[PDB]
Amino acid sequence: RPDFCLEPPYTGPCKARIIRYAYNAKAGLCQTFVYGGCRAKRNNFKSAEDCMRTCGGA
Secondary structure: OOHHHHOOOOOOOOOOOEEEEEEEOOOOEEEEEEEOOOOOOOOOEOOHHHHHHHHOOO
16 A cells, blocks of 8 residues: 555545545545545545555555
8 A cells, every 4th residue: 555545635725526535544445535626636536446456455
C-alpha cells in the first residue's frame, strides 16, 4: 500500500459535491468522501475496488 494511501482525503478548494473514494487507514478499507471538483490528490478514486487494488494489503 503506497504512502499517499495514508494521507487524509483532500476536498480541495472548488465547491462541487462529487463523491469519490479514499483509503481510510484506520478501517483498512476505502470510504467515500466529497471531492470539491479541483486539485485532486492521489488518494481519490472513482470506485471502491480501484481504491483497494492500489491501497489495499494482502
